[PDB]
Design an enzyme around this catalytic site. Structure first.
Site, PDB file in Angstrom:
ATOM      1  CG  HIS A 271     -65.296  19.827 -14.291  1.00 47.68           C
ATOM      2  ND1 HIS A 271     -65.942  20.401 -13.217  1.00 47.68           N
ATOM      3  CD2 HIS A 271     -66.028  18.740 -14.634  1.00 47.68           C
ATOM      4  CE1 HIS A 271     -67.020  19.695 -12.927  1.00 47.68           C
ATOM      5  NE2 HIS A 271     -67.095  18.682 -13.771  1.00 47.68           N
TER       6      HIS A 271
ATOM      7  CB  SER B 279     -66.398  23.273 -11.726  1.00 45.16           C
ATOM      8  OG  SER B 279     -65.079  22.756 -11.720  1.00 45.16           O
TER       9      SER B 279
END
EC number: 4.1.1.50
Lengths: 117, 117
Positions: free
Chosen positions: B67, B54
């Site tokens: 992500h 992320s």
């Protein structure tokens, strides 16, 4: 149904003072993350001159972001959460109250639909 | 006609090695920022065990986030830019190539429409 839920929100006619308060905005952003049930990994907030605040709260596999334009009482908010145990609408509710928005528009996106991945 | 342009993108069938490489992802996300002509404010990337990356590139009044789900060859990407001189699609292009996505879905939002604020 999908890996995550994502709320793209437009906040209008907010409390301009709060919108330009980088300290308060951070406090309310992390508190919104708490309300949704998310675990905060990290967060970074910056002040834009002459007016404006920008901050992101990185949570488990997703994020919470906000970008304000005090001059217009507007704020661009994003509440992307992953997992059934975390509800982005709880974050929305806290922020709506905190910023005193008079009008809001929200679109909910499914990120990573199971039938797609 | 709006303060910003926001691309909500779904990247499918990506290079799973790249998706799990926190060092390469940070590099490519910063390169995408350059490609869009945006100004980087801050950058923060994290790798979660067993898999997953992320990261967020906070730019002038907006952000670039990603992500990944290596196990699904999937990546949730957001390219939010402000200014006529910053093009989110240049970032999309660099990322699509870097991650070798074979299928993508993109929704473009106009954040802070002038007729709304």
């Amino acid at each position: 149904k999908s890996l995550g839920r994502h709320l793209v929100a437009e906040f209008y006619e907010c409390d301009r003072e709060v919108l330009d308060n980088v300290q308060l905005i951070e406090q309310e952003m992390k508190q919104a993350a708490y309300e949704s049930g998310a675990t905060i990994v990290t967060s970074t907030f910056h002040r834009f001159l002459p007016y404006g605040v920008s901050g992101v709260v990185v949570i488990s596999e997703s994020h919470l972001t906000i970008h304000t334009w005090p001059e217009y009482g507007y704020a661009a908010i994003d509440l992307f959460t992953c997992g059934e145990d975390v509800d982005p609408w709880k974050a929305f509710e806290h922020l709506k109250k905190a910023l005193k928005a008079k009008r809001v528009h929200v679109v909910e996106h499914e990120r990573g639909r199971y039938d797609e991945i």
